[PDB]
């Protein structure tokens, strides 16, 4: 009934807006005020506070909230120490956004009632959307997102043409894909020689610089690739990929928040 989300990043912002959309009370709060201002009309209560101070947790009546969400990115200690305080207030259910593998472990022994990997848990959902959509699968960019789709599609039993710019990732994904390839998706000859034309579903999960993401899709759209799915970064990256011909665009940060905003609603 009482919902509260800590940290208004891309993930923690997409949950305050969704929960407020259907019509549930949201106690949005972030470390500074730059984010809390734009979310003043996007939540039941917009608050500017630091989740590491006890008096700020008590004065906010946070204990009255059965569901607390720690979406504070960047420094992990801000995430951990927060949940550490929440578990002291006997918060019924604490959901936390973990970053790496050890974050999953340390949060698990604190008392974190749930841990979400936005890049990882989204790839397994996309790997389910590509499977129920039909044969030839190819994922470009073995980031955390592009690695969680090569790992999942291979699990059920579907051919995956995994490929990343450098070899460091393609090495650890040799037995995680049908074909591990080390190539730059911006060079035409590397796209042709890889038989990428035969793949109806190409996934551009190359994070970091957007141009590698875009230019890739730009090439793929030239090869008449039936369905190109792309990992966008910011709002403008959504618009530009849309005019290139990107058949699908996924925001691992944003799209996962609306799913968790649905998990907390149907939980009470």
């Amino acid at each position: 009934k009482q919902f509260a989300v800590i940290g208004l990043g891309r993930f923690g912002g997409s949950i305050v807006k969704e929960l407020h959309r259907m019509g549930h009370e949201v106690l949005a709060v972030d470390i500074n005020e730059e984010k809390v201002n734009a979310y003043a009309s996007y939540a039941t209560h917009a608050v500017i506070a630091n989740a590491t101070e006890e008096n700020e947790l008590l004065s906010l009546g946070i204990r009255n909230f059965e569901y607390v969400i720690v979406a504070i990115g960047a420094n992990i200690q801000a995430s951990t120490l927060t949940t550490l305080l929440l578990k002291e207030l006997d918060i019924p259910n604490i959901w936390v956004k973990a970053q790496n593998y050890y974050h999953h472990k340390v949060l698990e022994k604190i008392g974190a009632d749930r841990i979400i990997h936005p890049e990882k848990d989204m790839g397994v959902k996309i790997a389910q959307s590509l499977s129920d959509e039909n044969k030839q699968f190819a994922v470009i960019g073995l980031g955390r997102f592009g690695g969680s789709i090569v790992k999942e599609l291979h699990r059920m039993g579907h051919e995956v043409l995994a490929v990343d710019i450098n070899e460091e990732k393609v090495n650890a994904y040799a037995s995680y894909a049908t074909h591990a390839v080390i190539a730059n998706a911006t060079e035409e000859n590397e796209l042709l020689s890889l038989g990428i034309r035969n793949f109806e579903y190409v996934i551009v999960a190359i994070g970091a610089n957007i141009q590698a993401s875009t230019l890739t899709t730009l090439l793929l759209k030239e090869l008449d690739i039936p369905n190109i799915w792309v990992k966008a970064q910011n709002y403008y990256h959504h618009k530009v990929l849309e005019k290139i011909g990107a058949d699908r665009i996924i925001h691992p940060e944003k799209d996962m928040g609306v799913k968790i905003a649905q998990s907390l609603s149907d939980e009470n």
Binding site: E167, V170, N171, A180, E187, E190
Partner: peptide, 15 residues
Amino acid sequence: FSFAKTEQSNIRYPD
């Protein structure tokens, strides 16, 4: 080198 169709690989592979 005469009757050998020279081939150029541009993509690396795992260890």
